[PDB]
Design an enzyme around this catalytic site. Structure first.
Site, PDB file in Angstrom:
ATOM      1  N   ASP A  35       0.845  -1.192   0.000  1.00 33.20           N
ATOM      2  CA  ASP A  35       0.000   0.000   0.000  1.00 33.20           C
ATOM      3  C   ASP A  35       0.883   1.246   0.000  1.00 33.20           C
ATOM      4  OD1 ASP A  35      -1.921   1.913   0.258  1.00 33.20           O
ATOM      5  OD2 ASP A  35      -2.456   1.405   2.340  1.00 33.20           O
ATOM      6  N   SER A 199      -0.437  15.476 -12.214  1.00 39.01           N
ATOM      7  CA  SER A 199      -0.644  15.089 -13.599  1.00 39.01           C
ATOM      8  C   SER A 199      -0.887  16.331 -14.441  1.00 39.01           C
ATOM      9  CB  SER A 199      -1.842  14.140 -13.708  1.00 39.01           C
ATOM     10  OG  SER A 199      -2.195  13.919 -15.056  1.00 39.01           O
TER      11      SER A 199
END
Length: 330
Positions: A35, A199
């Protein structure tokens, strides 16, 4: 040193991925959920409330000659999906894919919430976010990657998740045969303890790319791709019959649909998520309404590049003095 371990989807939907991890002496092998959005290594154990264990493999520290109770240490964690766990702490030897750390904090669960009990395939979590998020008190503990870093050939790990297929986590090296083209690296903020990046935009299907900054986290522990409501609406508007359902809890679409791809930007580069990766199947057994893999982050407070996005790429988690993220197509 290096390590290399195969990671395998837990079910036919890629709801999560499990990777075998050796704990203790003699080794006890547990299948953990790696994770990158949390920083605790915790396991089902001989200390877990018996009614809360349903098929998981447990760590028994009393059978490990290298286990030592970390006196006074406790831990307690709550995840973004509402689940939680808590317990005490041992140090022990932990190996992943041939890479060994001695003195790793192994957080032994005394209590787990129902979603963990109900998932017999996940024996615990291995956190790979930054150690500033680790919940052990009163002395915060380091992640497996943080403890291994100095010994690794290069201070990196890579995630290569499969679509409906096994993949690989590598530690300490970049497998140049595992991706196509070049790796594009992008800056990381560690201020929230996550692998947080920006992004450069998105496209829906064959549509034109929209240049827009999207701050989010690379999180192997989250199944889906959570993005701003504007982006998610633009995606699902291209799918006939798709709608946001408050009763189901997100966007659903007709199971008879063929989904468009979704592209996200990494610098000047582009990662394409095939439409099939966005299909999470019937909302309930036998239903013709299917659950979408791209969902709004509006209720989270952060955008999450979860498995739906990451499994379309070869992803480099670069833990150099200034961390960065790398993405390549594959």
């Amino acid at each position: 040193s290096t390590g290399s371990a195969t990671t395998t989807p837990i079910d036919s939907l890629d709801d999560a991925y499990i990777t075998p991890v050796q704990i203790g002496t003699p080794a006890q092998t547990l299948n953990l959920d790696f994770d990158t959005g949390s920083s605790d290594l915790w396991v089902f154990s001989s200390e877990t409330t018996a009614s809360e264990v349903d098929g998981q493999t447990i760590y028994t520290p009393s059978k490990s000659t290298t286990a030592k109770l970390l006196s006074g240490a406790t831990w307690s964690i709550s995840y973004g999906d509402g689940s939680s766990s808590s317990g005490d702490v041992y140090t022990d030897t932990v190996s992943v894919g041939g890479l060994t750390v001695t003195g790793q904090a192994v957080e032994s669960a005394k209590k787990v919430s129902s979603s963990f009990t109900e998932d017999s395939t996940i024996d615990g979590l291995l956190g790979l976010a930054f150690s500033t998020l680790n919940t052990v008190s009163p002395t915060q503990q380091k992640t497996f990657f943080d403890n291994a870093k100095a010994s690794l050939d290069s201070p990196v790990f890579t995630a290569d998740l499969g679509y409906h297929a096994p993949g690989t986590y590598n530690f300490g090296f970049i497998d140049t045969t595992a991706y196509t083209g070049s790796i594009t690296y992008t800056a990381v903020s560690t201020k929230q303890g996550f692998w947080e990046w920006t992004s450069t935009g998105y496209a829906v299907g064959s549509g034109t790319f929209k240049s827009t900054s999207i701050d989010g986290i690379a999180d192997t522990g989250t199944t889906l791709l959570y993005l701003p409501a504007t982006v998610v609406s633009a995606y699902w508007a291209q799918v006939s019959g798709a709608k946001s359902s408050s009763s189901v809890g997100g966007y659903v679409f007709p199971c008879s649909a063929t989904l468009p791809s979704f592209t996200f930007g990494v610098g000047s580069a582009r990662i394409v998520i095939p439409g099939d990766y966005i299909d999470f199947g019937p909302i309930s057994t036998g239903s013709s309404s299917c659950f979408g893999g791209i969902q709004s982050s509006a209720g989270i407070g952060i955008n999450i590049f979860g498995d739906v996005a990451l499994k379309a790429a070869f992803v480099v988690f670069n833990g150099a003095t200034t961390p960065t993220l790398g993405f390549a197509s594959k």
